[PDB]
Amino acid sequence: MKSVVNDTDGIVRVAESVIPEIKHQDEVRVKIASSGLCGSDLPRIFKNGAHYYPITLGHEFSGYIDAVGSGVDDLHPGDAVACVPLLPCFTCPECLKGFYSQCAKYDFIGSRRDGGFAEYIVVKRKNVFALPTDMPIEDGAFIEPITVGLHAFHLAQGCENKNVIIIGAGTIGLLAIQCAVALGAKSVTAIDISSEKLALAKSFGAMQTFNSSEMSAPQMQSVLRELRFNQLILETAGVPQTVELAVEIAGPHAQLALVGTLHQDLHLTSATFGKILRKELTVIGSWMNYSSPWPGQEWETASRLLTERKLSLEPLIAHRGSFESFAQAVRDIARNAMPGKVLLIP
Amino acid sequence: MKSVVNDTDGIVRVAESVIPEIKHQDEVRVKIASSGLCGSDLPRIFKNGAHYYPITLGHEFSGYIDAVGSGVDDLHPGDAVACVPLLPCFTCPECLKGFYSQCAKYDFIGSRRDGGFAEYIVVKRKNVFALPTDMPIEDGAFIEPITVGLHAFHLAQGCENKNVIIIGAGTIGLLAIQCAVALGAKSVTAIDISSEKLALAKSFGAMQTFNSSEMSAPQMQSVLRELRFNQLILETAGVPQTVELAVEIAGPHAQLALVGTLHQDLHLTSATFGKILRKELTVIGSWMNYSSPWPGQEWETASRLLTERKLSLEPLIAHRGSFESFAQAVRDIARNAMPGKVLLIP
Numbered sequence: 001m002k003s004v005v006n007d008t009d010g011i012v013r014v015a016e017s018v019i020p021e022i023k024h025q026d027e028v029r030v031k032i033a034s035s036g037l038c039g040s041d042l043p044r045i046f047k048n049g050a051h052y053y054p055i056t057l058g059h060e061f062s063g064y065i066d067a068v069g070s071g072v073d074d075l076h077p078g079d080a081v082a083c084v085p086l087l088p089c090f091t092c093p094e095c096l097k098g099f100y101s102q103c104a105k106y107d108f109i110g111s112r113r114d115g116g117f118a119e120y121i122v123v124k125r126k127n128v129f130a131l132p133t134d135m136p137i138e139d140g141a142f143i144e145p146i147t148v149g150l151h152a153f154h155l156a157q158g159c160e161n162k163n164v165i166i167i168g169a170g171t172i173g174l175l176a177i178q179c180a181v182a183l184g185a186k187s188v189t190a191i192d193i194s195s196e197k198l199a200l201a202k203s204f205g206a207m208q209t210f211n212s213s214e215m216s217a218p219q220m221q222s223v224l225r226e227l228r229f230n231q232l233i234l235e236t237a238g239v240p241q242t243v244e245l246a247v248e249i250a251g252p253h254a255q256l257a258l259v260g261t262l263h264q265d266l267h268l269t270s271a272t273f274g275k276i277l278r279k280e281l282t283v284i285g286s287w288m289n290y291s292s293p294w295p296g297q298e299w300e301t302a303s304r305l306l307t308e309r310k311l312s313l314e315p316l317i318a319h320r321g322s323f324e325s326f327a328q329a330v331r332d333i334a335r336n337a338m339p340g341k342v343l344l345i346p
Numbered sequence: 347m348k349s350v351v352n353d354t355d356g357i358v359r360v361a362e363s364v365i366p367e368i369k370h371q372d373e374v375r376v377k378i379a380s381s382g383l384c385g386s387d388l389p390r391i392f393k394n395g396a397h398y399y400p401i402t403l404g405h406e407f408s409g410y411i412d413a414v415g416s417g418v419d420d421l422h423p424g425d426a427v428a429c430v431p432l433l434p435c436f437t438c439p440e441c442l443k444g445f446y447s448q449c450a451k452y453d454f455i456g457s458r459r460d461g462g463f464a465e466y467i468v469v470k471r472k473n474v475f476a477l478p479t480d481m482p483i484e485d486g487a488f489i490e491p492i493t494v495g496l497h498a499f500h501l502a503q504g505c506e507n508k509n510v511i512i513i514g515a516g517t518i519g520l521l522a523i524q525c526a527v528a529l530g531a532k533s534v535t536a537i538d539i540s541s542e543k544l545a546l547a548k549s550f551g552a553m554q555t556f557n558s559s560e561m562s563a564p565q566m567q568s569v570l571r572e573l574r575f576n577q578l579i580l581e582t583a584g585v586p587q588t589v590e591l592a593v594e595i596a597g598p599h600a601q602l603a604l605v606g607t608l609h610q611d612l613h614l615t616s617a618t619f620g621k622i623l624r625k626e627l628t629v630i631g632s633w634m635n636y637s638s639p640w641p642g643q644e645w646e647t648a649s650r651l652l653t654e655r656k657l658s659l660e661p662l663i664a665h666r667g668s669f670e671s672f673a674q675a676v677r678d679i680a681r682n683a684m685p686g687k688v689l690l691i692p
């Protein structure tokens with residue numbers, strides 16, 4: 001079987017190895033139909049970090065069950081499934097309350113482990129989610145990134161009838177916009193520094209857009225005045241300025257979902273911190289994309305949205321193709337400012 | 347009649363005046379029986395603080411109705427009342443939704459207008475709260491500071507069955523410990539730099555205490571391992587070190603209630619910020635102490651807790667006395683802060 005696997009930075013192109021076999025009673029073998037390249041998995045791509053180089057990443061994929069272990073009785077060869085990349089222990093106190101993302105002894109396909117840039121992969125039954133037969137199988141690669149946004153909505157007890165504001169017009173943010181619209185948000189606002197990404201956001205249903213390199217927070221809040229109640233704000237950009245921005249624009253009692261991780265420190269003036277208290281904001285930390293019963297309602301919702309064709313994925317796709325046309329992957333538009341998702345389609 | 351008048355630069359003085367008359371149909375005149383000094387006034391005395399000078403502070407008092415205006419139906423001379431010092435406009439969109447503390451055109455007794463360090467005061471009907479006639483009237487001066495902690499509990503949807511952690515053992519925090527014990531927290535933990543204040547906290551029912559000048563956040567989080575679920579953390583100290591501390595010790599999905607205002611900027615590492623997300627904390631900004639119906643459930647609860655005598659106020663009282671043992675007692679703060687509450691009794 002062919003594959004796409006890397007090591008200490010700078011190398012790739014395509015490899016060739018033996019098909020994995022089921023080695024445990026609760027494993028399945030998946031024949032991969034679609035597997036996508038994410039920004040999380042990125043800067044191990046050459047930004048290093050020990051880890052064992054060895055082996056490669058890839059946690060956003062779908063395909064069909066090829067074989068199941070002697071202990072698997074709820075899945076058969078040919079069943080459509082998507083990857084559920086996290087593997088919690090399922091038995092610790094955090095796991096028993098459905099806090100899978102707070103499990104101390106986690107595991108992760110395409111990170112801790114390895115994931116799916118190959119024709120086949122063997123994983124635990126718990127790491128696959130059965131898909132509707134009516135779901136286009138290649139859109140299964142988007143379920144995991146869709147659930148990132150849905151899990152924030154879930155933590156905020158839903159986006160329905162709320163004035164949703166998405167900060168950051170990356171793939172996750174763009175999917176959140178489409179989901180918010182599909183899920184009955186009163187309104188959807190997108191904020192980003194790129195006018196092209198905002199144009200994309202508007203085509204996805206964001207009724208208005210703010211360019212944060214052109215508008216100040218006061219100007220934004222002024223325009224938001226009609227929509228200042230029942231806000232649900234998603235910070236997806238993961239930069240200090242946009243966390244600060246979210247607090248400054250926020251209406252009375254807004255919910256503020258933090259989905260983006262920071263890599264720089266956050267400096268809040270006394271004034272800005274004071275606004276958290278004065279507006280009585282609720283700031284909600286969001287981590288990964290799971291809830292109980294495992295893997296969570298987010299996965300059902302994403303699945304449902306994708307089968308009933310509520311989402312537009314083509315504009316989020318920078319590339320489709322088989323191994324040869326994906327061994328491609330890496331070229332040199334540099335390592336990022338990514339157009340969009342890059343798909344492997346065996 | 348006498349009063350306590352604050353001028354600029356720490357100047358405190360006792361003055362003579364004429365008894366105030368009712369000048370509007372919706373006003374009442376209160377015969378003041380007990381009136382206390384708040385920590386937020388301390389900046390308005392020794393560090394500029396107040397929005398005008400000279401000023402009579404004092405938003406923490408109780409008394410008896412002396413007279414009512416022609417438009418007051420539901421109060422009569424002789425009724426015990428506590429001061430409700432905020433006056434929202436009651437007509438703006440925020441106010442209509444119960445967001446009184448987000449009213450933009452607020453009045454405030456002992457801040458925007460002169461307060462109750464005085465023998466009599468005239469205020470709007472809306473600025474008094476009828477007290478049970480079998481509440482000790484002097485304890486009325488504690489209702490407003492009790493409602494601060496109760497408002498934070500309210501924003502977190504209750505402290506019942508939760509492991510609450512009070513950070514900061516000042517008067518606000520000490521009352522919050524007692525309320526949590528009275529309201530049925532699963533456990534109460536207190537955190538402060540003073541071993542004596544923590545001993546005081548323990549005597550109020552905090553069944554364990556952490557001295558943050560001796561224990562690090564990891565040491566505390568380790569002791570808290572058994573109580574790590576369903577935490578409700580109140581930050582009352584209003585310094586950046588304790589906001590950072592609250593995030594570092596917090597268990598999975600803890601609620602963090604921000605009560606203390608910062609007067610320093612807040613600089614948080616990416617790592618501390620990451621923990622908000624990774625732990626999926628919920629951070630709740632708390633402002634003032636009101637809710638609907640005006641002035642809110644908090645006031646009704648503070649009042650019940652006092653009439654039921656569930657709270658212990660004497661170890662909170664640093665000073666009683668008339669207008670100039672009071673004046674000089676305030677003067678003796680100057681340098682630092684309060685050992686405990688200072689009260690004026692006629």
Ligand SMILES: [Zn+2]
Nearest residue numbers: 038039040041
């Ligand atoms: Zn990811």
Ligand SMILES: [Zn+2]
Nearest residue numbers: 089092095103
């Ligand atoms: Zn676990």
Ligand SMILES: [Zn+2]
Nearest residue numbers: 266267612613
């Ligand atoms: Zn800084």
Ligand SMILES: [Zn+2]
Nearest residue numbers: 384385386405
């Ligand atoms: Zn106060």
Ligand SMILES: [Zn+2]
Nearest residue numbers: 435438441449
């Ligand atoms: Zn108002």
